[PDB]
C-alpha cells in the first residue's frame, strides 16, 4: 500500500505538471491579438491540434 | 535459527520489486525541472521585448 | 487630435462589464477574439458575446473567447510597431517610454480596466488593466505583444487594480 500510495502521488504530481505545462503553452498563446500562432504551435507542439 | 533478518530473498525478484518504486518519483522530478526550464524560456521570450 | 482619436473610439464598438448596473471594467474584441479582465466582476454589455464560453488565464488574471466569423467581420486592429513617444486612449493622451505607459496624476481608476491604447493609425499597441499613483503622474499596468507574438504584461510593483 505504501509503494502504491507513492506511485499514486507521482501520478497526481505528473498530472499537475501537465496542467501547468498546458498553461505555459497557452500563456504565449493568450490569443494573441492576431488569431495566428502557426509557428508557435509548429515549434512547441504542446498538443491539442489547433485547429483547422 | 538462524532466524535472522536480511530480510530474506529473493535477490533477482527482490531487486525486481524494489526497482518498481521510486521511478515515478524521478519522472515527476524531471518533469518539474523541465517545466521550470520551459517557464524560463517563456520569461526570456517576454523579456525579449 | 484627441478629438479625432475619440471619434475612432466612438466608431470602435466597446462594451462595459455590468454588475448590478455598475461598470466594473470593459471587454472588447481584438484580432477576432474576445478578451475580458477576469479580476473584474460582472458580465459584458453584450448578450451575444456573453453567450460565448470563455477560457481562463490565471497567469495574467484574464479571460478570453473565440468570436464568430460573422462577428469577426469588424474587429480591432493590432500592431507590433510600438516606438517610444506618445499615444492616445479613452482618457486623453498617454506617454509611452521604457515600455511603460504614464499619465498625469488623477487619470485612471478602478473600473477603467479593458481600455486599449491606440497609435496615430488607430492601431492597438497595448491594453490597460490597472495602474498605480506615481507622484505627479501615475504608471499604468498594461499588456502588449511584440513582433514575436509574445504576450507581455507590464505591472508596477504593488500596482492597484484600476
Task: Identify the helix (H) or strand (E) that includes residue C151.
Answer: strand C151-154
Sign of CA dihedral C22, C24, C25, C29: negative
The DSSP call for residue B21 is: S
B residues 1..49 contacting C (CB < 8 A): 45-46, 48-49
Q: B6: which residues sit within 8 A by CB, 6+ positions away?
A: none
Residue B30 and residue C138: Cα distance in Å, rounded? 44
Chains in contact with B, where contact requires at least 3 CB pairs less than 8 Å apart: A, C
Residue C21 and residue B30: Cα distance in Å, rounded? 51
Cα-only R_g, chain B: 22
Which stretches within chain C are classed as H helix?
Answer: 2-11, 47-50, 69-72
Q: Are C40 and C127 in contact (CB under 8 A)?
A: no
Q: Does A15 touch chain B (CB under 8 A)?
A: no
Q: Which of A23, A28, A31 to mutate to test the interface with C (most CBs of C within 10 A)?
A: A31
Task: Provide the terminal-to-terminal Cα distance of chain A, rounded to the nearest Å.
Answer: 46
8 Å CB contact of C151 and A34:
no
Residue C126 and residue C101: Cα distance in Å, rounded? 9
Task: Provide the terminal-to-terminal Cα distance of chain C, rounded to the nearest Å.
Answer: 26
A residues 5..44 contacting C (CB < 8 A): 23, 26-28, 30-37, 39-40
* Residues of C tagged active-site: 39, 61, 113
Spell out the SS3 assignment of C111-144: CCCCCEEECCCCCEEEEEEEEEEECCEEEEEEEE
What resolution in angstroms does the PDB record give?
4.8
The minimal CB distance from A14 to the residues B22, B27, B38 is found for B27
Grid coordinates given for A26? 497557452
Q: Does B19 touch chain A (CB under 8 A)?
A: no
8 Å CB contact of B35 and A3:
no
8 Å CB contact of A33 and C78:
yes
Residue A28 and residue C149: Cα distance in Å, rounded? 7
Amino acid at each position: 500500500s505504501i509503494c502504491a500510495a507513492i506511485a499514486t502521488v507521482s501520478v497526481a504530481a505528473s498530472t499537475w505538471l501537465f496542467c501547468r505545462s498546458r498553461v505555459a503553452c497557452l500563456t504565449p498563446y493568450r490569443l494573441t491579438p492576431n488569431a495566428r500562432i502557426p509557428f508557435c504551435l509548429a515549434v512547441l507542439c504542446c498538443a491539442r491540434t489547433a485547429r483547422a | 535459527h538462524a532466524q535472522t533478518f536480511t530480510a530474506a530473498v529473493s535477490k533477482t525478484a527482490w531487486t525486481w520489486l524494489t526497482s518498481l518504486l521510486g521511478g515515478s518519483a524521478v519522472i515527476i522530478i524531471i518533469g518539474l525541472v523541465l517545466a521550470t526550464i520551459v517557464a524560463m524560456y517563456v520569461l526570456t521570450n517576454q523579456k525579449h521585448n | 487630435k484627441r478629438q479625432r482619436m475619440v471619434m475612432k473610439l466612438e466608431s470602435d464598438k466597446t462594451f462595459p462589464i455590468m454588475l448590478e448596473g455598475k461598470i466594473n471594467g470593459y471587454a472588447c474584441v481584438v484580432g477576432g477574439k474576445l478578451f475580458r479582465p477576469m479580476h473584474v466582476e460582472g458580465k459584458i454589455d453584450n448578450d451575444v458575446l456573453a453567450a460565448l464560453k470563455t477560457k481562463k488565464a490565471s497567469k495574467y488574471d484574464l479571460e478570453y473567447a473565440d468570436v464568430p466569423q460573422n462577428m469577426r467581420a469588424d474587429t480591432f486592429k493590432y500592431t507590433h510597431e510600438k516606438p517610444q513617444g506618445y499615444y492616445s486612449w479613452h482618457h486623453g493622451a498617454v506617454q509611452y517610454e521604457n515600455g511603460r505607459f504614464t499619465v498625469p496624476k488623477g487619470v485612471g481608476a478602478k473600473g477603467d480596466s479593458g481600455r486599449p491604447i491606440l497609435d496615430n493609425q488607430g492601431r492597438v499597441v497595448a491594453i490597460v488593466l490597472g495602474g498605480v499613483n506615481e507622484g505627479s503622474r501615475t504608471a499604468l499596468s498594461v499588456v502588449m505583444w511584440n513582433e514575436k507574438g509574445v504576450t507581455v504584461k507590464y505591472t508596477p510593483e504593488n500596482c492597484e487594480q484600476w
